[PDB]
Amino acid sequence: GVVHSTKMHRTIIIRRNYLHFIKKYQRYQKRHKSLAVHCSPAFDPKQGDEVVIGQCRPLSKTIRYNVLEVV
Amino acid sequence: GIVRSRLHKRKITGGKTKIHRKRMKAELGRLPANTRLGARRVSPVRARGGNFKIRALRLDTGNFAWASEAIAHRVRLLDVVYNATSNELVRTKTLVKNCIVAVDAAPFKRWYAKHYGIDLSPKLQREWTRRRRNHRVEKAIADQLREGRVLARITSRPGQSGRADGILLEGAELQFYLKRLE
Amino acid sequence: MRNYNNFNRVWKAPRRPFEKERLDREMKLCGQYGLRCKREIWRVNMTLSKMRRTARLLLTLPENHPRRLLEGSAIMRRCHEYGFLDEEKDKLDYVLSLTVPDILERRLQTIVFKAGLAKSVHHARVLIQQRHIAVAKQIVTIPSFIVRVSSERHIAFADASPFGNGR
Amino acid sequence: AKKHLKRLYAPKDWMLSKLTGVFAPRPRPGPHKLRECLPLLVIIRNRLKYALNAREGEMILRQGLVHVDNHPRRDGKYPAGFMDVVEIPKTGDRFRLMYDVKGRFALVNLSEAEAQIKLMKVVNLYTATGRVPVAVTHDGHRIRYPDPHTSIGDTIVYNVKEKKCVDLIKNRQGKAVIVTGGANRGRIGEIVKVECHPGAFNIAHLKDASGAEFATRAANIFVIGKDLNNLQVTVPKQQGLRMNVIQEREERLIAAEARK
RNA sequence: AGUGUGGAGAUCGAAGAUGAUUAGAAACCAUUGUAGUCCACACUGCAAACGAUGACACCCAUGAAUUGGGGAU
RNA sequence: GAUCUGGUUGAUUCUGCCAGUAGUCAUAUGCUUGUUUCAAGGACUUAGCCAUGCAUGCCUCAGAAUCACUGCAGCAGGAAUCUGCGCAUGGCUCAUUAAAUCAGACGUAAUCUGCCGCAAAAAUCUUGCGGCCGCAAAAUUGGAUAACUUGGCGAAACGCCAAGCUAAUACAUGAACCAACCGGGUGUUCUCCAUGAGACGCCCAGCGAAUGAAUGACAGUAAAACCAAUGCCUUCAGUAACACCCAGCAGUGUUGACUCAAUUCAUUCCGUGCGAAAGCCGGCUUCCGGCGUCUUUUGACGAACAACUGCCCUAUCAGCUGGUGAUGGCCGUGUAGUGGACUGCCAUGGCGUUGACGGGAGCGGGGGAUUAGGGUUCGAUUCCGGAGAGGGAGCCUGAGAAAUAGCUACCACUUCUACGGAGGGCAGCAGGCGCGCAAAUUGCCCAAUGUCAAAACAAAACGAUGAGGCAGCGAAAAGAAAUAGAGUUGUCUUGUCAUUUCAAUGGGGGAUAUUUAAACCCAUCCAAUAUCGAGUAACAAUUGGAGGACAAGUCUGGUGCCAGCACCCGCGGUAAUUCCAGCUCCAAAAGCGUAUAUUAAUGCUGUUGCUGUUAAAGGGUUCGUAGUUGAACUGUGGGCUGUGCAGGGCCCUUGCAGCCCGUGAAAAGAAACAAGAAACACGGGAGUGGGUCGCAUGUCAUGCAUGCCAGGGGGCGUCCGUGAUUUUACUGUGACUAAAGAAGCGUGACUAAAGCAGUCAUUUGACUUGAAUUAGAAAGCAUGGGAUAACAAAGGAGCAUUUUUAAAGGAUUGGAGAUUAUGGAGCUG
RNA sequence: GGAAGUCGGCAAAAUAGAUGCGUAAGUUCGCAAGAAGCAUUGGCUCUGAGGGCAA
């Protein structure tokens, strides 16, 4: 995913942009999801950076993933 | 009763969840022990699966480890002096995990004498010389031991296990809590 | 409730209820094959439509598609077995040319009539309904029984019938 | 917990007709998973025809006449899945529960001293108290001191009468395996390569006798011998060789014509 | 066209007045005339605001013209 | 079957709707109805209200029987009651419900888990006898309480007291020696050496749990010194370790990854864990079986939680959330467990025109209808998931419930009463009342399918089950199929006609019977010595129509813009093709009309695939942000032979072998090429360190062990460390994906709708019978391809040669750990 | 009991401070508004936050 916000302490918001296909019109739609991710102090990601994330146990009300690598 | 489910919470959009089921037994919570310092009193809680949690209402003895010497001793708790959640819990003498307590130091002194022959059979004296070769007690510890109270950190959960066990504070952590207590 | 026995329809009505040419053709088929109602012709129509739809779907495929090799073989086998198609023609395209009289010719009523056991298709109908006809010694009372080519030589009067060996 | 099993929801390989009844015997917990088992009542009633109904099946089973892996089993809901040896001494029949090439359960007849052996696939390895290594098999057996070379995925050839390990068939390239799940269940092939995808399902690439290539998840392969020529277990008639559908239809038609 | 505040106020001219015409004539016609019509500043945002024909881009036959800029003689 | 027709005009060509038409397991209603098969069936409105009855119990050889119970002569049955298990399943319904639920696909290393499978178990000072000791050994443990008896209370209550008895596998208690291995701590205890070493004494050292401290490996440098201790040969080569009684009784758990598995040390459980049930029954005093139960463990059956992509309409819903949790952090608490789930404290977050928030209609799928294709639509309802039991909320027990034929309370209704009190929950089955357009019997049965359970069947001795099955009612719907077949004379080659002859057959009536749990249906038959029945075959077919659409009368009476018809156009005002009737004819036919929905018809919702000058419809004009869309280019591979209606030595096909496959630069190496590559390095790396009956080591040893291609160089497998980086999308394969349903193979259930069966053999069984195959959006998993595209980066002046040798400077063997230094490999100039 | 008194709620009763939450029609957009309403405040013993000077 791409980093969307770094406003939180040790947590970032990422975006997963993708195309969704509508069968009836044989065409695609732009869609996005947003995931809250825990970011370790071992990384310093910025807005627009690409990140690999991995699923973990629930860490808060929304956090279900961990930053594993910053491209 | 008390529930741990997420249904009552607002969605992240701020909207209200429209609940369409009654609350379940499998998501219950229970009232906290609020364990205080005093003569022992524990109440079993029948938990899911038929297992028993031990809910401690009052505790005054704990099994406390001196990690550097890799030993432990059953000692009387004298006062709870620091709590990171709120100093209201220090005032109520509440025993929760990671709260700082003062434990009776005399047993650690007596073990120190038995294991090193120092007060703060030839074969045992051979052993005493075999030890002490790379051993130097800390000043911050031995000073506390002389006055008969050591600062320790509770490592168990009195609300779950019914025990106020712990470990003696040493090193930078001990300095941290000593600074915060002055 | 909790009953899983299947059932389906076997016929469909014509889209146009009054076409003079269709009505005349159907009345002809009724008179010549001795049918009771238009539902029998329409049942043959549904059978033919299903077979033809299958053949079109199969012919659209490349010739060596495994589905074509399997189902084309099966449908040719069935058409040859029941006498709908002549055994000479063996391509998948000849099912598309099947007509209603081709299926109607293989009814037990028409077969009994053509075999001389009956003076007419109307005689054949009542002969079949009255248990006087057996196919391989099995009494067949259904005039719409489609006769296989192999069973054509075993159609005689029933043993229990007074026209066979019965009282 | 569910005590019932609707007949429509029951596994298709049990060959229970949708019109015979609403229910099927729900397999109890035991040696095998209920989606991968054949209940004893199903065996004794539908497969062997020794019992005409469930009442006669209970009469036969509650007497201890049917043995699974040398022990009498009195429960019609006992799972009794793959590689199990079923013996009814009073009638003398004895067989191993296997998968045929179509993937259905097959009752492969056995000789004595063949019914004393069963193959068990190691699914987990753990240390028990006292530092005792224990191998857990696909059959739910917990073997208390396996061969020190035992790995997860290997096969243990096991003497059920003596309750002793006999030999170990390691999971390596060129070994003969049988597929125990998926679309290829029942096919016998050779391990040509096993690609590892950590955190995912490892894929085993196989090759049967006729050179047809196929794959499946590594969890679905069961080592049964060193080679397709020398198997450590007898296999059903088709020998795990999948036959062409057109060929099958043609041969069945010709054989039926020959019968008439 | 209409609105507000200042200005302007020749002409024409909704309202209105008077005279005709007419069965009646609140109309058309005649003579007038307020608001308007004009300007500054601020509003209003509607027209058969039309080519009743959205914008950008490509191909596309013939003759005589026309507006602006270039080139040749 | 990729289909249209009637109505706008005096006529025409359009646009366009209205009407027609076909289907619906799609409902109702009307008329009609002989036979048979297969089936829906109080969902829609009122998750409205309910009389009565039934719906969940379980015992055998194997828990407890002194019934004052029965039979027999102690045996055998055994009411009752205690005990163990179940009652959290099944059945019903669809009210709630849109980051919920659900589908496919994943996780739980974040957890609980009775019944079932396979396993494990060495803690424990007991008992009886003489005076705490001694002796001894198959442990002969203890108090209760039901049923029963006595007295009874109460109107009643699936309401109750109090005294006597007496059991359990209920409850409580409790087992020393036999009996092992291993470790830690210790005596001012003895030997013996010069600080070792060994004995003996005692304190502990079981499973599980808690805290603490260690293990839970290594794996990119080859060598020789010194001090100390300790191993060795003799008086530094080899060498797993280990200061004896086991000279190999773990130097090596698992994963993708773990603070997990397991082990050692210390301290603590214990006031809420751990019997050999101090148990039962069988065979042969002796052994040997079958059960039953406590604790530990893991895998099976589950449970709970999390969420990758998808999921109606509405902006005349634009901001939503954050006192008092909203988004995140820290230490806690609570939970089985994660977690703002919750306390305290901090920081301002989080979501939204890619539609948040709010409002409306809906349980979600599997699937159904219709369909050339693309689509449209339905899905209360059989399978799967969820939810609820009048409404709400609490809870106990239990492995599992926030249970409702469990409890508690309130709100509505509501039943009995002696007025003191006591009760109730059909959205289980049947059946009422209401509501409605709208939906069956207060039936039989556990024979089948299953569930529970102390339980095979049977023998004095038959478990319960409205779950389920069976029948009744039932023109929802579906399949098959009667209402006649042959004639003769004449009448008028046929064909109608009045006859007057034959046969045939069911509907129906029955049965030696068959079926079925018993019945009923289906089949079989109308002698097998011995069995009924058609001629108006009265055993009598209907429902709508006859101007057009649209098949069928320019018939005859009646009515006279009335009555009426007519879906639309229209007909009827005295010669009605249209009304009311007779006749005749037409269509479908045991069915056929009507109403309302819905699909096609409809290219009248248009992605495929509409229209916008004048028919409805381009915004008055620009600017402009999300959005959509967006120009080229990095790129002809070459030689050789043969072969082709190639064509005007060349190009072009087909096909086999060559290429460093542009130039350059040569067995090795250099250029491109590689992350699936390269450079290193790991026996705890590879079925022994991979493909390429004798000898030797040692022999106090199950040393019963080990080697008997060396060596070089290459090719590999595994695992780790260091080094340039390329995705997505599309497309091809492959894997993973309940049945029922849809396609489909085979198969004469008489056919068919079906079903998954059956078929064949002079006969105790073959067919080692069959039950093929597919498709089933999207997302997800692995991998081949690189043409069209997308994402990201850059904006070309922050854009920077390979080696050789030399000097100058600043981890490994060495006997193994330690220590302590040389000596290097490895850094700049 | 609660305006039945009286011409008429005259008179009297009533409301009340502070703090948090909350607040309609209408509107010249300023208000209406202290609209209406709901809640809390004592005493003790503590805890937290909010500063200035110098080396």
Ligand SMILES: [K+]
């Ligand atoms: K229930």
Ligand SMILES: [K+]
């Ligand atoms: K019925």
Ligand SMILES: [Mg+2]
């Ligand atoms: Mg104006």
Ligand SMILES: [Mg+2]
């Ligand atoms: Mg003027």
Ligand SMILES: [Mg+2]
């Ligand atoms: Mg004027």
Ligand SMILES: [Mg+2]
């Ligand atoms: Mg005029």
Ligand SMILES: [Mg+2]
């Ligand atoms: Mg004028």
Ligand SMILES: [Mg+2]
């Ligand atoms: Mg007209």
Ligand SMILES: [Mg+2]
């Ligand atoms: Mg005219």
Ligand SMILES: [Mg+2]
């Ligand atoms: Mg119902």
Ligand SMILES: [Mg+2]
């Ligand atoms: Mg209802």
Ligand SMILES: [Mg+2]
């Ligand atoms: Mg008994």
Ligand SMILES: [Mg+2]
């Ligand atoms: Mg249920």
Ligand SMILES: [Mg+2]
């Ligand atoms: Mg019902």
Ligand SMILES: [Mg+2]
């Ligand atoms: Mg464990």
Ligand SMILES: [Mg+2]
């Ligand atoms: Mg939060």
